[PDB]
Amino acid sequence: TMKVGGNLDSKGYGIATPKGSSLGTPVNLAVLKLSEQGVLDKLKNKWWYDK
Amino acid sequence: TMKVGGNLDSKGYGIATPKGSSLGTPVNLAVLKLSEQGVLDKLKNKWWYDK
Amino acid sequence: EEVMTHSGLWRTCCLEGNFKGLCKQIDHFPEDADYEADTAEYFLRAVRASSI
Amino acid sequence: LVYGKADIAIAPLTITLVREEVIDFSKPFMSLGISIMIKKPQKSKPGVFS
Amino acid sequence: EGNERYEGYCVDLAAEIAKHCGFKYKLTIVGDGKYGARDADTKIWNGMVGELVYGKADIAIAPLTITLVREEVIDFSKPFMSLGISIMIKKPQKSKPGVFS
Numbered sequence: 001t002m003k004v005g006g007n008l009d010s011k012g013y014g015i016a017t018p019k020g021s022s023l024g025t026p027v028n029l030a031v032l033k034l035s036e037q038g039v040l041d042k043l044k045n046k047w048w049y050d051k
Numbered sequence: 052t053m054k055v056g057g058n059l060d061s062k063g064y065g066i067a068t069p070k071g072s073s074l075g076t077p078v079n080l081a082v083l084k085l086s087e088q089g090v091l092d093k094l095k096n097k098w099w100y101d102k
Numbered sequence: 103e104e105v106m107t108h109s110g111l112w113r114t115c116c117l118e119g120n121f122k123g124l125c126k127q128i129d130h131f132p133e134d135a136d137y138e139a140d141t142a143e144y145f146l147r148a149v150r151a152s153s154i
Numbered sequence: 155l156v157y158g159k160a161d162i163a164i165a166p167l168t169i170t171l172v173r174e175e176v177i178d179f180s181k182p183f184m185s186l187g188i189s190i191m192i193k194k195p196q197k198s199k200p201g202v203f204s
Numbered sequence: 205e206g207n208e209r210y211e212g213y214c215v216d217l218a219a220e221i222a223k224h225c226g227f228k229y230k231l232t233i234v235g236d237g238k239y240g241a242r243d244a245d246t247k248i249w250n251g252m253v254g255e256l257v258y259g260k261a262d263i264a265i266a267p268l269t270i271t272l273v274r275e276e277v278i279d280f281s282k283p284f285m286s287l288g289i290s291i292m293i294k295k296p297q298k299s300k301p302g303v304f305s
């Protein structure tokens with residue numbers, strides 16, 4: 001099976017906490033540290049391209 | 052000038068406020084209400100590709 | 103700026119310019135992004151650089 | 155999430171207006187877009203006597 | 205005057221943000237002409253992050269990248285446009301085909 005076209009639109013996956021949880025700030029200070037340290041990208045590679 | 056290669060990481064621009072500014076949540080809900088109607092891409096087209 | 107050039111082998115000259123009957127000695131020269139060193143050019147370029 | 159059965163969601167949960175109404179999304183960790191999938195339309199092979 | 209002096213993607217998006225939230229807005233230029241970092245020694249945030257920390261403006265609408273050391277001191281919205289660091293060079297000429305083409 002094969003893709004055609006590009007993207008139709010923009011969407012995204014975010015980490016979601018119930019509203020007002022005390023998780024909501026440490027989760028973001030984690031995710032943004034993973035982005036600024038390049039860990040998300042090898043988590044993508046290890047599953048889409050190595051495998 | 053010309054581009055080469057891929058990108059070294061991925062990031063984005065965010066609308067920023069002083070911490071605890073009352074605008075933070077209605078601005079987030081605005082950015083969603085815009086992207087869910089394609090307004091952000093339509094504006095990107097108008098300033099990158101239509102020029 | 104620019105002229106109707108009248109270019110030879112060992113020199114280049116011009117006509118109908120802002121002055122007339124002034125001619126330039128021929129030479130060779132690197133350009134932007136180099137690419138004068140490109141071997142398929144450089145072969146030709148080093149040959150054109152002379153009346154050999 | 156919203157009715158307290160689960161303390162956090164870590165999954166391909168798409169950020170949307172109608173979901174941020176009731177839960178808080180972090181900054182996105184992976185970009186995507188909607189796209190079409192079909193059967194691969196016969197990427198062909200010539201014969202030796204083509 | 206006002207906002208019509210400025211044209212651009214962030215001006216359009218500022219007009220959309222205002223039209224949704226109901227407030228008026230006044231586009232202003234960062235005084236030091238920088239995006240913003242914190243000093244090594246004085247720890248002063250410069251740039252628009254400085255302007256935000258010192259209460260110069262209620263909101264910032266610019267190509268300011270969501271980054272962790274800024275999330276320490278200010279809040280960012282969801283990304284309105286994505287990107288990555290990349291490479292710009294002067295392009296070479298379109299090559300003439302080889303002598304043995």
Ligand SMILES: *[C@@]1(Cl)=[C]C2=C([C]=C1S([N])(=O)=O)S(=O)(=O)[N][C]([C]1[C][C]3[C][C]1[C]=[C]3)[N]2
Pocket residue numbers: 007009010011012063082083086089091092095169182185282283284285286287
């Ligand atoms: C679009 Cl249309 C929308 C969003 C992004 C990028 C694009 S595009 N195809 O490059 O023009 S974004 O930069 O990934 N930021 C997203 C957020 C909106 C929303 C939250 C996040 C993801 C959903 N919008």
Ligand SMILES: NS(=O)(=O)c1cc2c(cc1Cl)N[C@H]([C@H]1C[C@H]3C=C[C@@H]1C3)NS2(=O)=O
Pocket residue numbers: 012032035040041044061062063064181182183184185186270271283286287
């Ligand atoms: N290469 S990717 O699609 O898996 C991908 C895409 C993105 C990542 C991280 C990865 Cl690994 N982080 C950014 C976020 C990080 C921070 C900065 C922008 C947002 C907040 N969103 S993104 O630009 O959509």
Ligand SMILES: N[C@@H](CCC(=O)O)C(=O)O
Pocket residue numbers: 166167168169
């Ligand atoms: N990831 C989607 C579901 C799968 C899809 O629609 O492709 C969501 O969060 O709703």
